[PDB]
Amino acid sequence: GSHSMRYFSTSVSRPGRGEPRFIAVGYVDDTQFVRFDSDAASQRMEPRAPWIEQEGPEYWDEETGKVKAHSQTDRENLRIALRYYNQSEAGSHTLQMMFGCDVGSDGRFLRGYHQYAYDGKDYIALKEDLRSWTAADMAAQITKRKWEAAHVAEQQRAYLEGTCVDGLRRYLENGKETLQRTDPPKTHMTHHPISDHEATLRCWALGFYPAEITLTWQRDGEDQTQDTELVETRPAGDGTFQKWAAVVVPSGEEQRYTCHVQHEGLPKPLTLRW
Amino acid sequence: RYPLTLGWCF
């Protein structure tokens, strides 16, 4: 299947209390592989998945240098944003960035991303064509005109289609035993009477990877959306994910309900019935 | 593999 590499960075100013805190994390698909935290003692990009520990000392030197440069860049950008928005040096602000690339099953470039948010809102984003910018407000329009005149997008595109894709291909191969593995969900049902005329059926999916999954309850084969209690897919903490869906049913009618489980790691969808 | 930040100035 197709794969993604993503980096997510967060800078948060804290005026009077030193320079902004910068945290960056890198992912391949749903698996984190590196981190950097400007407040941490090491001052190094650090490994967060076993397969990236294969990389030698030059890699860590290189990545540390590059992520620290980003830290400084986003320090600069926080200062500029203050000016663009006419905001005081008193308050704390947040600058986020996401970038990375998608590749198909043969390893070919699919899509690129390069985007910013200021204080939780869209600021500026590279369009899918990787040639054009979307400015979300008047301040970001200043940045957009600056970047258009300087043809900044061309070297951003080069990274997304080049360096990004080559890194992802390398990571996918080095970590193929875990990254290209599929762990299908282990499923079960629970059943709890809540009164003498109603009972809860809860359908569980556990230990699955990747995170994408669909859990659906059907009654007589019909829609149960409004009546389904569904939690957001959540990390187990060991590299896998969990989810459940629950319906309240009339006692004695359990056999009328089916829970449908769809996941990439299943040969065919599962149908569960109490 | 991290990018360079040339061209990232607001």
């Epitope: 290189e62 240098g65 620290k68 400084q72 061309e154 070297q155 | 593999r1 360079l4």
Partner: T-cell receptor
């Protein structure tokens, strides 16, 4: 306009300390120090983004140290100069967008016994 | 790991010849390349910058090409003049850091 370095020339006796200064192009966020001897390409010493010293080489040995305390200007100091230190010390700054390096005219050091 | 090579390292040519100067680099993963000229005793003058997404760049009588996968850049000097006599230096910035890595240069003499 251009990158400015001072002093342009410096002669000293072995064991003396020396300090060179670089004033980069104003709007440039990165500053680099290089060392060059006749017939060779410049060799990298260190660079800054704003005040942060983000990379140094092995040629920036213990006697060599640089700082850029406010962003802006940078200082390269060599302690206990030796005749082997004699070289052209070059400073450059680079643009925010292309990262094109623009060099100063250099500080040429001659260390004598 | 990256080695920047400029061969031939010295040239003597008749004025008016359309010249080619060579640069090669062992590691293709470069962000950009910059050509400079240097007169004896002096500093460096930036001539052209080629981004990794560009195949060529031009400025007056100067053109430069870049072939990343082949690890080559060529500086072209059209209608060479005695005033072009100088050392020409090729340098690359890697995808992995911000510094330039320099070749040793090609010394050019253009005879009047």
């Amino acid at each position: 306009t251009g990158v400015s370095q001072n002093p342009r020339h410096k002669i000293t006796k072995r064991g003396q300390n020396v300090t060179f200064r670089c004033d980069p192009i104003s709007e440039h966020n990165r500053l680099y120090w290089y060392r060059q001897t006749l017939g060779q390409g410049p060799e990298f010493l260190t660079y800054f983004q704003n005040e942060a010293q983000l990379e140094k080489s092995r040629l920036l040995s213990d006697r060599f140290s640089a700082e850029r305390p406010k962003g802006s200007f940078s200082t390269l100091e060599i302690q206990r100069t030796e005749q082997g230190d004699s070289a052209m010390y070059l400073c450059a700054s680079s643009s925010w967008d292309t990262g094109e390096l623009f060099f100063g005219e250099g500080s040429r050091l001659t260390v004598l016994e | 790991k990256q080695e920047v090579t400029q061969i031939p390292a010295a040239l003597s040519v008749p004025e008016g010849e359309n010249l080619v100067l060579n640069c090669s680099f062992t590691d293709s993963a470069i962000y950009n390349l910059q050509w400079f000229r240097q007169d004896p005793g002096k500093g460096l003058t930036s001539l052209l910058l080629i981004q990794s997404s560009q195949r060529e760049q031009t400025s007056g009588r100067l053109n430069a090409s870049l072939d990343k996968s082949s690890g080559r850049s060529t500086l072209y000097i059209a209608a060479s003049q005695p005033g072009d006599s100088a050392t020409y230096l090729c340098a690359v910035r890697m995808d992995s850091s911000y510094k330039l890595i320099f070749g040793s240069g090609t010394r050019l003499l253009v005879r009047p």
